[PDB]
Amino acid sequence: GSSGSSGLRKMVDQLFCKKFAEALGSTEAKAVPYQKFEAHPNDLYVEGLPENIPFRSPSWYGIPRLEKIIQVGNRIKFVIKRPELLTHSTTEVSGPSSG
């Protein structure tokens, strides 16, 4: 997590990445497996989200939606009922691959 992040989408992306990590108990940022959360929304999900606002990628969230989330991004929470689903994180990678 570095200071900057320009663009809601980006910011939001990071926001979650971070939060998501927190629950995971990591120092560095990671990619939120929206899939795992989709195939296991009862296990893997988020808390402290905005009303009338689900939990999806930032590339989906509206322009105003993002911010709204960012506003409550300080109250957001990530529950890892089953982290195993993620099955570790590291996998021979150093740097932003693809994006």
UniProtKB/Swiss-Prot annotation:
Q: Where in the chain is the Glycyl lysine isopeptide (Lys-Gly) (interchain with G-Cter in SUMO2) cross-link?
A: 30, 36, 68
- Where Phosphotyrosine occurs along the chain? 45
Q: What does the entry report about post-translational modification of this chain? A: Transiently phosphorylated on tyrosine residues by BTK in response to B-cell receptor stimulation.
Subcellular location as annotated? Cytoplasm; Nucleus
- Where in this protein does the record say Phosphoserine is found? 59
The tissues where this chain's protein is expressed are given as:
Ubiquitous. Isoform 1 is strongly expressed in fetal brain, weakly in adult brain, muscle, and lymphoblasts and is almost undetectable in other adult tissues, while the other isoforms are equally expressed in all adult tissues.
Q: Disease linkage in the record?
A: GTF2I is located in the Williams-Beuren syndrome (WBS) critical region. WBS results from a hemizygous deletion of several genes on chromosome 7q11.23, thought to arise as a consequence of unequal crossing over between highly homologous low-copy repeat sequences flanking the deleted region. Haploinsufficiency of GTF2I may be the cause of certain cardiovascular and musculo-skeletal abnormalities observed in the disease.
What is its quaternary makeup? Homodimer (Potential). Interacts with SRF and PHOX1. Binds a pyrimidine-rich initiator (Inr) and a recognition site (E-box) for upstream stimulatory factor 1 (USF1). Associates with the PH domain of Bruton's tyrosine kinase (BTK). May be a component of a BHC histone deacetylase complex that contains HDAC1, HDAC2, HMG20B/BRAF35, KDM1A, RCOR1/CoREST, PHF21A/BHC80, ZMYM2, ZNF217, ZMYM3, GSE1 and GTF2I. Interacts with BTK and ARID3A. Interacts with isoform beta of PRKG1. Interacts with GPR50 (C-TERMINAL DOMAIN).
Q: What does this protein do?
A: Interacts with the basal transcription machinery by coordinating the formation of a multiprotein complex at the C-FOS promoter, and linking specific signal responsive activator complexes. Promotes the formation of stable high-order complexes of SRF and PHOX1 and interacts cooperatively with PHOX1 to promote serum-inducible transcription of a reporter gene deriven by the C-FOS serum response element (SRE). Acts as a coregulator for USF1 by binding independently two promoter elements, a pyrimidine-rich initiator (Inr) and an upstream E-box.
Q: Member of which family? A: Belongs to the TFII-I family.
This protein is called what? General transcription factor II-I
Q: Which organism is it from?
A: Homo sapiens
Per the UniProt record, the lineage of the source organism begins with: Eukaryota, Metazoa, Chordata, Craniata, Vertebrata
Full-protein residues shown? 466 to 551 of 998
